[PDB]
């Protein structure tokens, strides 16, 4: 769309100006049930060839149901919250006796509904499959005859269509032990996920966003396994809500900034230890240090606010002017000189130092730029690859406009050797 | 496989932080971060500076507002905790809570003689 950036050469850093946040701020719980009936012994004579697969398939179904019966850089300053919280709370509400009977009775014919519980929680109900009708009309009248024999094999293959889903649920919850990250399409088909998008109490622009990013909400959703009792087997999806949508959110890339002293090891240097995402949420900014938590999709970031900081709104002031008497402007410092390079959305920041080859090269003209010393920058729409030392990188060829500002060697404003070199977290 | 065979004298430091028996390892920094953590039976809020600090539940709205300092809420009085711009949900799993009175330990020392440049330390 309108991706832009401003690599400051004062401190080696990239700001990803222009994005829309679409941040989760809460969970919306929903219960999903599959109805199912208890099957007794086979009550059949012989083994045959037509009526044989029914026996192994019903034994597999029995194994599944009895198995599920048996079933039941600022990360150091980053807060920790139990993400699997509301769903296990809803399961715990379901553990009370006579409560899941309300779901059983109230969701008798309607596919989706909303019921009230004994804790005032009235989230949602939904049934995913109807093994009542199929089991008690198309399987058990046939398999439980005198000297049983199926009419045709076409009966049992659709039984595959009505049992591989349940077996997928069983094998998903058996491996990941109740909690699944993310939610598989077997726990919710995608068209039904869209139906659920059209169900929860959100405003319609959130509905459009979640519809256009069903893969994102599928990736961030969790699943917790609730009870099995009175054979109304059900679980809870803890699919993400989305509180604040469409605010500018920038990605701060950072790079080493080391003076080019020929004497090795005596070149103290520093970076902004502020790599991550900053979204302007409410009268503050949500800061995400762990870049792996945040996801990106076509100008739309998606990052869960449980692992964030409610940092004050005065952060662009330090972002532009590093030397301000308003923000702490946190610093990583060390005398270690490492040749390295990072990739922003619209180019690459090279920070090779000392005896190290530094090249930006593209497949059209071969090599196109050589960096002598100091951190430098290359726009993405002039080059495909960047080589530093003995390693290569490919830049994002996504279209966007770049502007490279003139900066200055900030670390050379101070004395060459008075700096400490023994801290990860610091500030100016 | 990823553990420490730490000596049996660890509850002594766990109750009494100032003891001449254990090292009682310390993280230290001057950085002031509003944050909150969740235990099994409640929430520890540690918001500082100008930051909204609320323990609220869907029954009757908000139920506690925190001025400053770290404070605590039992899980069986509240569903959600809001710090700054983010919300967390507490574990509703049933258990008994007891909140003991403590003291501002860091105010026992001088306000500014502390170092601020170590991740691993001890008392």
């Amino acid at each position, epitope marked *: 769309q309108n991706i832009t950036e401003e690599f400051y050469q004062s401190t080696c850093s990239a700001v990803s100006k222009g994005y829309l946040s679409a941040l989760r701020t809460g969970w919306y719980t929903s219960v999903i049930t599959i109805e199912l009936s208890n099957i007794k012994e086979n009550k059949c004579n012989g083994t045959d060839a037509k009526v044989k697969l029914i026996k192994q398939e019903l034994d597999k179904y029995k194994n599944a149901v009895t198995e599920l019966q048996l079933l039941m850089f600022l990360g150091f300053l980053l807060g920790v919250g139990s993400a699997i919280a509301s769903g296990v709370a809803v399961c715990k509400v379901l553990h009370l006796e006579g409560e899941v009977n309300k779901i059983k009775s109230a969701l008798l014919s309607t596919n989706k509904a909303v019921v009230s519980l004994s804790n005032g929680v009235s989230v949602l109900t939904f049934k995913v499959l109807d093994l009542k009708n199929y089991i008690d009309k198309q399987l058990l009248p046939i398999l439980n005859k005198q000297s049983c024999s199926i009419s045709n094999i076409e009966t049992v293959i659709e039984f595959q269509q009505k049992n591989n889903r349940l077996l997928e649920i069983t094998r998903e919850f058996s491996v990941n032990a109740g909690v699944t990250t993310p939610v598989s399409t077997y726990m919710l088909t995608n068209s039904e996920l869209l139906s659920l998008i059209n169900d929860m109490p*959100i*405003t*319609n*622009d959130q509905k459009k966003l979640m519809s256009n990013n069903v893969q994102i909400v599928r990736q961030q959703s969790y699943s917790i396994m609730c009870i099995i009792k009175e054979e109304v087997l059900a679980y809870v999806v803890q699919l993400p809500l989305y*509180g604040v949508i469409d605010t500018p959110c920038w990605k701060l890339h950072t790079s080493p900034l080391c003076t080019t002293n020929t004497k090795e090891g005596s070149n103290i240097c520093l970076t902004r230890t502020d790599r991550g995402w900053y979204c*302007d949420n409410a*009268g503050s900014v949500s800061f995400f240090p762990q870049a792996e938590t945040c996801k990106v999709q076509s100008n739309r970031v998606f990052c869960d606010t449980m692992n964030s900081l409610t940092l004050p*709104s005065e952060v662009n002031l330090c972002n532009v002017d590093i030397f301000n008497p308003k923000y702490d402007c946190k610093i990583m410092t060390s005398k270690t000189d490492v040749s390295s390079s990072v990739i922003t959305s619209l180019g690459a920041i090279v920070s090779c130092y000392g005896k190290t080859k530094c090249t930006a090269s593209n497949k059209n003209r071969g090599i196109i730029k050589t960096f002598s010393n100091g951190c430098d920058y290359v726009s993405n729409k002039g080059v495909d690859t960047v080589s530093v030392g003995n390693t290569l990188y490919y830049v994002n060829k996504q279209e966007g406009k770049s502007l490279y500002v003139k900066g200055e060697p900030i670390i050379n404003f101070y004395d060459p050797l008075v700096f400490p070199s023994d801290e990860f977290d610091a500030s100016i | 496989m990823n553990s420490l065979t730490l000596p049996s004298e660890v509850n002594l430091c766990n109750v009494d932080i100032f003891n001449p028996k254990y090292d009682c390892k310390i993280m230290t920094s001057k950085t002031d971060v509003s944050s909150s953590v969740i235990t099994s039976l409640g929430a520890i809020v540690s918001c500082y500076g100008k930051t909204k600090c609320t323990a609220s539940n869907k029954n009757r*709205g908000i139920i506690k507002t925190f001025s400053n300092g770290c404070d605590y809420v039992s899980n069986k009085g509240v569903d959600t905790v*809001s710090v700054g711009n983010t919300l967390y949900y507490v574990n509703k799993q049933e258990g008994k809570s007891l909140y003991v009175k403590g003291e501002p330990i860091i105010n026992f020392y001088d306000p500014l003689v502390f170092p601020s440049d170590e991740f691993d330390a001890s008392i």
Partner: antibody, heavy 121, light 110 residues
Framework: VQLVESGGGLVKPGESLRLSCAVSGSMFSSYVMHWVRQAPGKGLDWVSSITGGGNYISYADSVKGRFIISRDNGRNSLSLQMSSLRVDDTAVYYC???????????????WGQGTLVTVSS | QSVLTQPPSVSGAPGQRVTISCTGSSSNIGAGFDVHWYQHLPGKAPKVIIYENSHRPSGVPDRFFGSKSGTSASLSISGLQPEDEADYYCQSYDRGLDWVFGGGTKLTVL
């Protein structure tokens, strides 16, 4: 946190014209914007919504594309265009700066002064 | 035309407690949406009395008391005061008409 807007007057129905919205807030980049209207007599109802970058527009059933809304965040301003008009659309129009809810919902916090637009005769 | 219904004929002398109720269909409010009471005194801008039925805004007196139940929201005021003359509203996010507003109640003193 205040809000001043203009664009009122007596114009015949059927023609497009500007409605300005000139909030002076510092962090007007994130908060949701709505336009509502209070008719003479009959009470107030919602008209138009716009969300940040303006990629999730929504309108009430009175105007399906008849009122087109756009904000320039760089100029921290907002504008509504009367693509189509009707004689019943006379009302006092209000810009309103809503804050996102605990879920997502607009609270419609401190409003503008409200500009009277008349389209009679 | 409004799906939200509230009686626009409620008034009393200053001093007592008056309760206002606004109700809607099932597709709004009872479908997990919140109600927000406003005021519309003539002259200056309309502002919020209370929002989502429990959070009052910053500067309000404690006379206003909001509550919700199903599709019905209630606002009770004890000790009526002279400048309570206003048109009080209710809103939600019905899945049909997106942002809806009620008829409103004209509160005045005698």
């Amino acid at each position: 946190v205040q809000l001043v807007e203009s664009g009122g007057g007596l114009v015949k129905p059927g023609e497009s014209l500007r409605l300005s919205c000139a909030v002076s807030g510092s962090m007007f980049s994130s908060y949701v914007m709505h336009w509502v209207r209070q008719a003479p007599g009959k009470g107030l109802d919602w008209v138009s919504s716009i969300t940040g970058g303006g990629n999730y527009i929504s309108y009430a059933d009175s105007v399906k594309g008849r009122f087109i809304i756009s904000r320039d965040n760089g100029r921290n301003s907002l504008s509504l265009q009367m693509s189509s008009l009707r004689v019943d659309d006379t009302a006092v129009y209000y810009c309103v700066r809503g804050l996102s809810g605990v879920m997502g919902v607009t609270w419609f916090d401190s409003w503008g002064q409200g500009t009277l637009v008349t389209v009679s005769s | 035309q409004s799906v939200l219904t509230q009686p626009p004929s409620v008034s009393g002398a200053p001093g007592q407690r008056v309760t206002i109720s606004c109700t809607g269909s099932s597709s709004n409010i009872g479908a997990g949406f919140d109600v927000h009471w406003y005021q519309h005194l003539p002259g200056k801008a309309p502002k919020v009395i209370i929002y989502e039925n429990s959070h009052r805004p910053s500067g309000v007196p404690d006379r206003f008391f909001g509550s919700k139940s199903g599709t019905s929201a209630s606002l009770s005021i004890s000790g009526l005061q002279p400048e309570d003359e206003a048109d009080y509203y209710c809103q939600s996010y019905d899945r049909g008409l997106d942002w809806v507003f009620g008829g409103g109640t004209k509160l005045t003193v005698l």
